[PDB]
Design a protein around this ligand. Sequence first.
Ligand SMILES: [Ca+2]
Ligand SMILES: [Ca+2]
Length: 315
Amino acid sequence: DEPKTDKDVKKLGQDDAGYTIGEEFKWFLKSTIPANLGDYEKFEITDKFADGLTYKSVGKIKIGSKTLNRDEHYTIDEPTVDNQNTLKITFKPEKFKEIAELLKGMTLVKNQDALDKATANTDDAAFLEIPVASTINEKAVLGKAIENTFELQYDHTPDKADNPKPSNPPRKPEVHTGGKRFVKKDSTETQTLGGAEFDLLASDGTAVKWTDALIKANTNKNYIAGEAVTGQPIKLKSHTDGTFEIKGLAYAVDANAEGTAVTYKLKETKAPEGYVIPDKEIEFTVSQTSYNTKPTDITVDSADATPDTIKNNKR
Ligand SMILES: [Ca+2]
Ligand SMILES: [Ca+2]
């Protein structure tokens, strides 16, 4: 009857997701609920978040359809620099009976596999669900899985002895973000061309906008056309050596860190002096290896992937 635990990302049942830096998403810390929860003398969850994740908030803690209330049923200690980005959630031992009473008409999820596979949390199949809002920040390595887990310390014995045991997710969820490098050249890929300007767009043509975290991930001002401001469209520029890049775009959106690449596009709004503005957007893809060749082998970007050459035609 003792707790089994699991962690998900994006939505219940999902273990892998890809994000653009600064986009807020949820982790889900999950536990089965013991039938004898009323007896428990400790129920405390600790989550040390990787450096490349920024904690945002804790959502509504749910068991089946019902919500537990902050500072009434549990207490939160938030991630800070001082505690090495660590979240703690402490369920109040003196509320263990009250919480158990809330569970009365619910059918409880029992075993690990069912917890792992759950895509919903309902009265008919209930468990403890802790959504934690998070972003991937500028400290991420492009193409590198960022894992998360937690540990539950539970005391199931109502014996007045402080003797908790651990419960740990057997398998860990992860997120990832990517990038791309470019070089602007003439029509035969000979001369490098400075001063081209591009709007960064999603594949459907929606402009990608700055957020403060994404701004912090794109610190080389030579590659940015004008000022970067949160909420405004991303505009890139080729440097005097023809080069530019974009760092922190989603790929493998619903897959592991090796998963499906995502297409983005560039609208050339200004051509190098003497050259023509094209009608058609230039596409590129972001993948695990489109910025770093070997992201599993590093803790900071190498930026060694082969840039895409973008051609320009003469006036
Ligand atoms: Ca999971
Ligand atoms: Ca005990």
